[PDB]
Structures are given as structure tokens and as C-alpha cells.
Design a protein around this ligand. Sequence first.
Ligand SMILES: CN[C@@H](Cc1c[nH]c2ccccc12)C(=O)O
Ligand SMILES: CC(C)=CCSP(=O)(O)OP(=O)(O)O
Length: 346
Amino acid sequence: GSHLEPTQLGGLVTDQLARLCDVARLDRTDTETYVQTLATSLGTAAERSLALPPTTATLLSDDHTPVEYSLAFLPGATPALRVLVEPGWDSGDLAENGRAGLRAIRAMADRWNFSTDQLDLLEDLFFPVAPAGPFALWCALELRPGGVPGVKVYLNPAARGRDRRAETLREALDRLGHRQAFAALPPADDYPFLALDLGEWAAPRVKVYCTHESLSAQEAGEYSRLGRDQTTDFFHAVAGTPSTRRALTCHSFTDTVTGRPSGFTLHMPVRSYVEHDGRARDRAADVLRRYGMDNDALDRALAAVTPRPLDDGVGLVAYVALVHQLGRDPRVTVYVSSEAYAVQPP
Ligand SMILES: CN[C@@H](Cc1c[nH]c2ccccc12)C(=O)O
Ligand SMILES: CC(C)=CCSP(=O)(O)OP(=O)(O)O
């Protein structure tokens, strides 16, 4: 059973996650495991009344819910379900938030027998005494069949101040053995996130995010070099095309030798391009359909999250991403908001 009520943050999010597990076709056992894993990872936030304001005005989601869901669609397969959580969200300040987040990661490492050595290597870079914003630690859980999830940790290159973003990112990549990766990164307006895979890997795997305030379809195609035409068509499809849009690229480095990324993702914040979620869902559905992906599952996933009409707001479909990975089929990922605190109006 569950100690959480539907008036509590944990009750709402576990209900949403359980329904999403059905869309992902996870069995009852795995579903129970992951609903409990989410509740535990939220800590005291799980029991917080939804009537109180969000403890932290987090960047994780627009309405400051410390959870966001995503579904990764591959051609002809049921989508894979992931959840992003901020374990330290119910804390008073950023330093306490980060401490609680690291504690959560350590508990996961103990439970699932993986090492935090690579993460520990970076602690002084990303968790200083008086950290800067906008966040401290997020955790992405890939909810795989079997009940043992994939785990990634997200860290803030601006933790030691905005002026040290590049210095911090470059020193982290160096410590991790990725001494040529920075040179592979496109021009950017921010380095909002560094992600580290945690698990059974003898060498670090990292993902570097770049914010582009005014990215063009042509530039997106350029940066996808690890392909160009699929990335440009995706840009137009999701952007609905003015000539430039705000977007993020992710650059995944899975070996330390070449300095070349093995993965590239274009993340399009569709919620910023459309009037309401009816339009955002339309564009995501069209992209999935064109790629031969499970577009019916998208509709079921949205309904699993909220029963509201899609046109009654915007931001439920937070992002659509095109994921390229050497040696794999392209993937489309749709990011879906919890809306535990607010529905942004059209
Ligand atoms: C309000 N959400 C933040 C962080 C974020 C959540 N999910 C993402 C997916 C892709 C890129 C970023 C994000 C933002 O929009 O930047
Ligand atoms: C959750 C955030 C902050 C960004 C998108 S998650 P991602 O690009 O790493 O997706 P994958 O783990 O590579 O499938």
C-alpha cells in the first residue's frame, strides 16, 4: 500500500507514474518498484501538501514540480519511460538541496551496486560551499523492465558562478578523461547541464548540454555531425516554421579517445512555440508518425498524466527531442510535465 494521499505531492506524482508505467507496458511488480523509488527519491517532499507553495522555485519544470516525465520512442516499439526528479527539492537552500541530492544518489548506488567514484571526482566543482543557481542535482531514472533502473546524474556548470561555467565544465571533462570533448562542442549561449551516467562502466560517459538562444534550422543540421536533413526537417516540424528559435543541443561522449561525440540530441521547447498543448501534441504526433513510432502511446501518456483538455493550457508537452546515436536508430523523446502546481494558460 501507499502512505501517500492524493492531496500530497507524492500521491499525485506516484499516481501519474503508475499510469505511465501502464503505457510503458511495465508489469505490476516493476510498476510498484518504480512508484516506490520515486516516492523515496523525493524524501520529505513526497508527503508535502499540494496546498502549500513549492518548497523550491526549481528550474526543473515551469510550475516548479520536482518531477518531469519523458517517453523515448523507437521505430516500432513501445516507448521507454523515464522520470527526472530533484531529490533535494524540499530543502531550504541550494547547498542543502545538493547535499540531499547526493545522499539520494548514494542510496541508489548502494541499492543497485554501482560506484559513485566518478561522481565523487567532481564534488568540489559542482557542490561548493555557497553554490550559485539555478539548481544543484537532478536524477534521471530510466524505468527499465526488471525493476533495476538506469541512472544519470545532472550537475550545474554554473555552481561556482556564471563566470566559471566554462572553467568548471572544462575541468570536469579533464578529470573524467574527456580531454578533447570540449573542443567538439558547438558555439553556445549557455552550458546549462552536465550529465554523468552511473552504472557498470569502467570509463566515464558524459552528456554536455548547450543552450542556443537563436538557433536556425541550418545550424541545428550543422551541429548534428557526430543526419543533417533529418535534423533540419525536425526543427521545422517542431518549430512550426521566423528563422531562429531557442533550443538545446546535447552532445554525448561515450569514449575518451577520439574527442568525437557518439550522440547528438536536438531539444525543442515546443511549449514556447504554440498556443496550447493541442498544437504541441499535434506536432509531436506528426513527428512520431513520420518516423514510424508509437504515436498512439503518446496520447495515452498525456491522458495518464492529466485528464484536462489539451487546449486548456500549454506546457504539458514541454519538449520534443530528436536523438541520434552512432549505430542506433533515431529516437524521438517527448517530455511531459506533471502540472502538480499550475497549468500555464494558452
Ligand atoms: C523548465 N525545465 C528546464 C529543464 C528541463 C527539463 N526537461 C528538459 C528537457 C530538455 C532540456 C531542458 C529540460 C528547461 O526547460 O530548461
Ligand atoms: C532531462 C534533461 C535535463 C534533459 C533531457 S534528458 P537526455 O537528453 O540525456 O536523454 P537520454 O538519457 O540520452 O535518453
